Amino acid sequence: LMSLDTALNEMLSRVTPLTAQETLPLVQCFGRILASDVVSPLDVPGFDNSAMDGYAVRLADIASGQPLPVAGKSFAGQPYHGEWPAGTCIRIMTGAPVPEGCEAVVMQEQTEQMDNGVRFTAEVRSGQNIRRRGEDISAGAVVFPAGTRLTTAELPVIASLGIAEVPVIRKVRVALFSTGDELQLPGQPLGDGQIYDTNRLAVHLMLEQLGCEVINLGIIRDDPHALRAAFIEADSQADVVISSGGVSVGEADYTKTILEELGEIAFWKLAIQPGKPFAFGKLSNSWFCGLPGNPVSATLTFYQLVQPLLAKLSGNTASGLPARQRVRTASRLKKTPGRLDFQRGVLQRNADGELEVTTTGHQGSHIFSSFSLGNCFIVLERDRGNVEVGEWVEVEPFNALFG
Amino acid sequence: LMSLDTALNEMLSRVTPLTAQETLPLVQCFGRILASDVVSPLDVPGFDNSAMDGYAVRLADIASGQPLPVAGKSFAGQPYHGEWPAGTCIRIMTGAPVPEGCEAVVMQEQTEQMDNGVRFTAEVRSGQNIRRRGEDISAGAVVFPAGTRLTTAELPVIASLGIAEVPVIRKVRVALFSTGDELQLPGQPLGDGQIYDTNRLAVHLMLEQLGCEVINLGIIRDDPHALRAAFIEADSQADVVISSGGVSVGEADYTKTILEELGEIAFWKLAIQPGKPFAFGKLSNSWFCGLPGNPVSATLTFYQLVQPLLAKLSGNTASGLPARQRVRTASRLKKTPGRLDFQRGVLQRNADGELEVTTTGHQGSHIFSSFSLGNCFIVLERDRGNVEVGEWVEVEPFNALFG
Secondary structure, three states: OEOHHHHHHHHHHHOOOOOOEEEEEHHHOOOOEEOOOEEOOOOEOOOOEEOOOEEEEOHHHHHHOOOEOEEEEEEOOEOOOOOOOOOOEEEEOOOOEOOOOOOEEEEHHHEEEEOOEEEEOOOOOOOOOEEOOOOOEOOOOEEEOOOOEOOOOOHHHHHHOOOOEEEEEOOOEEEEEEEOOOEEOOOOOOOOOOEEOOHHHHHHHHHHHOOOEEEEEEEEOOOHHHHHHHHHHHHHHOOEEEEEEOOOOOOOOHHHHHHHHHOEEEEEEEOEEOOOEEEEEEOOOOEEEEOOOOHHHHHHHHHHHHHHHHHHHHOOOOOOOOOOEEEEEOOOEOOOOOOEEEEEEEEEEOOOOOEEEEEOOOOOOOOOOHHHHOOEEEEEOOOOOOEOOOOEEEEEEOOHHHO | OEOHHHHHHHHHHHOOOOOOEEEEEHHHOOOOEEOOOEEOOOOEOOOOEEOOOEEEEOHHHHHOOOOEOEEEEEOOOOOOOOOOOOOOEEEEOOOOEOOOOOOEEEEOOOOEEEOOEEEOOOOOOOOOOEEOOOOOEOOOOEEEOOOOEOOOOOHHHHHOOOOOEEEEEOOOEEEEEEEOOOEEOOOOOOOOOOEEOOHHHHHHHHHHHOOOEEEEEEEEOOOHHHHHHHHHHHHHHOOEEEEOOOOOOOOOOHHHHHHHHHOEEEEEEEOEEOOOEEEEEEOOOOEEEEOOOOHHHHHHHHHHHHHHHHHHHOOOOOOOOOOOEEEEEOOOEOOOOOOEEEEEEEEEEOOOOOEEEEEOOOOOOOOOHHHHHOOEEEEEOOOOOOEOOOOEEEEEEOOHHHO
């Protein structure tokens, strides 16, 4: 009944990003969010230097018109030292500091290198091909703002400024558990209507790969006292509490009444497929997310709702959602208007070097295989009906959680 | 002069994937390489179960044409083990194991309930709506072959078979260090032409994010005894040794002679941009990769050369270099023929929803900001010249290492 976009937006609109911080050496900062602006202590570059290979000149010498003999050279780790007589030029390479008094650099391509001097003929503009102290980064400038996610792109830049450690927002703590008499641990043969708990491991893996701190409470016994106790433990030590399967997502039982006894929790019916139900709400000291029991649904719901929630909570200011692109189906898709359908597809290059999607196979929620075979979601619009081969389709490549 | 593709093949063809293994609980296998096939110790599904919400019946009871009452219900976690007399049916729910003697299930849609029981509107053939029972995964089958990189896709499935731990190939060990009296650590001033060591960080971070075990030996003093000591230690404790900068990549010096002394190392001149030189060869107990000192060149060379070497060493059988696609430029690109140019760009969607790349800015290697600003490489062909707005271009989206 409820649209995904509306659900997500409402979840996000309630949530306050963490602020608690810690200072860490750069090597431990991958994936972490900066807590405070990183300000440059230095000018980059540190001195005026040459944009190209050629000659360092003065405007007056060129105006004179004669070939200019080479008085010396400036390179990478060796500026030109010694006097620069009038009517001469200095040989120079990219990144080499420009000699005192230099007004321009001329690319070697514009010049005629003769035995008794370099002949210049193209016009020379004051300042041309000189990179100036600090033109890339000036001391006192913000290099990366609070809220930036730190990656191999950013951290080495910080290191280049001589900064050994930065402040970052603490990891989001997430308490995880499941419940139900059916649920079985590995090693034990399945009892009556029993199955192995798979949701909990799936959520645990994603959480860790998302950079969260997980508190896995295991399988809670089918008992309202044990459940009440799990929630209290979960909520007191975590920013977020996830039930990966077995707590009610709408259906009345002893789990739904505990939920109603411990927080203000909404039970949503999402206009998506696969899945539909999702519990979301404030506990005393945490956010609660309740997932459906079906593996496929739980994963998809986690991936599409919980993941963005965790991202806002973490302090990350990178606005926008996972990257979608318009693509042609090389496969006929069974689609039913009413639900936003996240089918699993295989996005690959065709003979013509063009990108196209192939269905992974049967899209039913009774098999898990589509996450392994697939490498993307085909996001089929809510109102859209069946899709013929060659039609335009929205695709959402899988992020690292699925390879 | 030497093409990237030829260098890649020569490196990779010499390498032998690791085989030493350890056995770990599933929750610690993300990104890890299965050492041995995962073989299913059971069927999936376990018992023949119902594909829909409906009624389990027999073909003889249906024959009477008579409204047959409900003898009981079977649920997912609550199989039915009661009586099932002659002229009756069993209420059933999708996933629920079918009761003994069942021959078909009907959906409740081809069904209407009367005071005297369930009246069957349509026709009922043998097998209808029953999931027969290891159809998805048969006991004794290979679920996941050795060499598979484990992900949220695979791990929960392994748990669904009640497996606790799997054997995995051990992490590749990579020793790392830089050298040069000109490299300086943070906190300490920049002497004559001293700079802050950045490449070591960048490589460290990428190695960690690739799942490698890093042995970072820091900056080694410009002394044959310290350098030789470092190499001997590195080579003896790791599968790969990397100079992030400072060790010779061709130019003769005391570093080069240690290199030639401890193994057989070639000094390549690659037809790429940014970058060009790369040292590679066999030491006594390890592979050695020497990177150029330019930050942008060291990063690009690591990402295009060392990464795929490490993937192969890891046991990963995921044959292939990261995905590439054809796309138009909204940007003019300067390009010199003779070198395969890995420029950085910004892939994004245009108004009509199509994908396009814009340059990050200046493509020189004096600055690092293009890695942050970018989300992809514009891989410009070796023989190509300048590119104009609208031309078709090859693009390789950045992986997780850059965000």
